[PDB]
Design a protein around this nucleic acid. Structure first.
Lengths: 145, 145, 145, 145
DNA sequence: ATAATTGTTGTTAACAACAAT
DNA sequence: ATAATTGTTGTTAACAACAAT
């Protein structure tokens, strides 16, 4: 089913989900930073999720896009505390009110400019809900050294 | 300040919170049905909680009132599972995004036409959230038999 | 839906379920002795249930009957330990593998000869799985004083 | 007597129990997938457990062998929920109706064609209970890719 | 006076969190 | 050397059990 999640992400964000994240083949592996793509997200929840995640993220950047074929939202989360994909998954599958199957979770791609610019580009749009000091790895890669 | 609540609730709904709830002097005492009074509830979170609770309630009724003195909402919850105030306090605190301090929890006053009518009347405004088969106790005491 | 459970019990056992049990209007009320009518019971489970309940009943009498219109089984359980309808319900809904809705639980009718004879009559058939010393109240009422 | 088990299992299945399970030295360590070796299992309870587990497993495979030396069954369980041996020990003990002593529990040996084939071979006898989508790990290691 | 009703207290699955390689 | 992997340990919903009227 990923085939679709992925395909929809592309047509919606003009780039592969892979392009912005690095792989974690184990669901039990704990991490602080996470990239989340949510399909079929309800406006109200998306709104809530923001206010809610603030309470436990050093940084958080939420973005939602959509059209007739589908709707998707990407989250660049930075939990104050390391979380496994499971934990993150469980937590979010609920906070957002979508079956787990409507989620895509992989740790961000840090070393990579194409990637850094994705987050930077986003942060430029107003619609994007932002909270926190733009992460180190993104600036360090998108600044005139 | 519980008094300032009761008062506010009274001020807002026009009848002591006591007139619709039966005493439970133990936070560890579990029950399926509960009556919730929430104070300072964010518009969004109210809307959210409703869609979210549906996943775990057999019956749910929500009303929210306010004015230039404060905002307060009421819940008549019938959890599919029994839960101690301890639990509901936790669940609803984080769900509504408020301090445990902003919540009043006691099981409904099931036997007593007056109260039983409260929900009836409430179930008459379109600006109210309904869900599930209206409770036997509430139904009986308010229909010609 | 009880209407059916009941109706099926009759056509299957030639008597009302009420005829053999006394009412408990509260599900949280604990009791040792229980009468159970299970609809849609699977042979294998019915068999198992026997062996399983033995481990925790001073007495137990199981009986299963059926036909095209439906199938039903009655249990006269005597838990070594007092159990609420809930507890009993939860326990059995699972041990038997039927939704709760396929259960009927009420404490037996002790003072009553028509009732005593039901259990006695049953215990006379071979098919009936029996375990334990026939309860006091049944003998005391079905013996030549 | 664990040795008498292993031996019996070996005697019964023709290959060390070790050849299909990965070490977990902590009963409190939780996991979704488990391999169960049960000894002295009542015909009925085996049949029952299968229909019963289906309610809580994404994949399940059961085989039961015996001779004039003893009886032993094997389970490849993939619980929808993670469970420590502690838990499964309890759950399966009471479900199969045997002392904790009659159970051997270790997570499967997922990486290793040999073992991976065990289930494959096993999935070739009609006298075996199947349920759900055969596991990625088992599938991969045994199909032309 | 049977039960309806809460107290009140253990036990334990379902998890998060994190040490440790 | 990143993660994949279990240890290992709290916290707490989901309950049974039972005191008490």
């Amino acid at each position: 089913a990923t085939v679709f999640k992925l395909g929809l992400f592309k047509s919606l964000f003009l780039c592969s989900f892979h392009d912005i994240t690095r792989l974690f083949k184990n669901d039990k592996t704990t991490n602080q930073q996470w990239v989340l793509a949510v399909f079929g997200l309800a406006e109200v929840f998306f709104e809530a999720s923001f206010e809610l995640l603030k309470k436990q993220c050093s940084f958080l950047q939420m973005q939602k896009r959509s059209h007739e074929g589908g709707t998707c939202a990407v989250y660049l989360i930075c939990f104050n505390t390391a979380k496994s994909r499971e934990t993150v998954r469980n937590l979010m599958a609920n906070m957002l009110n979508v079956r787990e199957e409507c989620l895509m979770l992989q740790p961000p791609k840090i070393r990579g400019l194409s990637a850094a610019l994705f987050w930077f580009k986003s942060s430029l749009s107003p619609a994007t809900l932002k909270h926190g000091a733009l992460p180190e790895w993104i600036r360090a890669q998108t600044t005139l050294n």
